[PDB]
Design a protein around this ligand. Structure first.
Ligand SMILES: CCCCCCCCCCCCCCCCC[C@@H](O)O[C@H](CO[C@H](O)CCCCCCCCCCCCCCC)COP(=O)(O)OCC[N+](C)(C)C
Ligand SMILES: CCCCCCCC/C=C\CCCCCCCC(=O)O[C@H](COC(=O)CCCCCCC/C=C/CCCCCCCC)COP(=O)(O)OCCN
Lengths: 83, 70
């Protein structure tokens, strides 16, 4: 552990730019896998409607599918508003 | 004595020749049949041979496409 600490201390002097570069790059590599908001970003990307939502033909066997936009069935965006 | 200790009878060679001739005739017939079958398969394309690939239909996407007319 002493050699690594000595190397880090000697690099922080006379080479701070490279130390900052490697630190920032490593943090950018590591942090996204540990953050809990990346799932939120994925969900936000999912909830952006670029296309028309084509309706499905009702056969009396789709209780989860709403018949009107105001019906309580279907995905909700209350979580997005609370963000 | 020479015939007894060095050679066999005529029937051995006779029947060995019969077997050899049968094998060779069968092989010749098979070769001709194989050539004809190859010609037919290459001309028609309806056999297991000479099958050239076409696009796999599992690659097609069957979904609404932001436009009603595909
Ligand atoms: C009074 C006598 C007058 C006649 C003299 C005759 C002289 C005979 C010598 C000529 C030999 C002819 C060559 C034969 C070799 C091929 C035949 C071969 O097929 O026979 C084999 C037998 O091989 C013989 O033993 C080969 C003999 C060769 C040796 C010659 C003797 C003298 C050579 C000198 C050797 C060195 C001398 C030492 C010096 C220091 C068995 O084969 P096989 O597939 O089962 O036959 C099937 C038929 N069955 C059912 C009857 C068995
Ligand atoms: C793992 C992450 C990787 C992704 C991030 C990378 C981002 C971009 C950085 C890479 C760019 C290219 C770097 C090229 C490296 C060349 C090194 C080199 O040869 O330089 C030496 C000098 O530098 C060295 O001594 C070699 C490297 C020294 C170590 C650098 C940092 C190593 C790691 C330190 C940081 C570790 C993590 C930080 C955590 C801190 C807490 C957050 C020679 O320099 P000269 O021009 O010849 O001048 C010398 C005469 N005056």
């Amino acid at each position: 552990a002493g050699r690594i600490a000595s190397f880090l201390k000697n690099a922080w002097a006379k080479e701070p730019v490279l130390v900052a570069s490697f630190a920032i790059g490593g943090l950018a590599i590591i942090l996204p896998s540990l953050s809990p908001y990346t799932n939120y970003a994925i969900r936000i990307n999912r909830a952006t409607p670029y296309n028309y939502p084509v309706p499905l033909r009702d056969d009396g066997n789709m209780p989860d599918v709403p018949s009107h936009p105001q019906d309580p069935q279907g995905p909700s965006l209350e979580w997005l508003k609370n963000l | 004595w020479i015939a007894r200790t060095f050679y066999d009878g005529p029937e051995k060679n006779y029947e060995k020749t019969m077997a050899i001739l049968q094998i060779e005739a069968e092989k010749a017939e098979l070769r001709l049949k194989e050539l004809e079958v190859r010609r037919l398969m290459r001309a028609r394309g309806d056999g297991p041979w000479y099958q050239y690939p076409t696009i796999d239909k599992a690659l097609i996407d069957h979904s609404p496409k932001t436009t009603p007319d595909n």
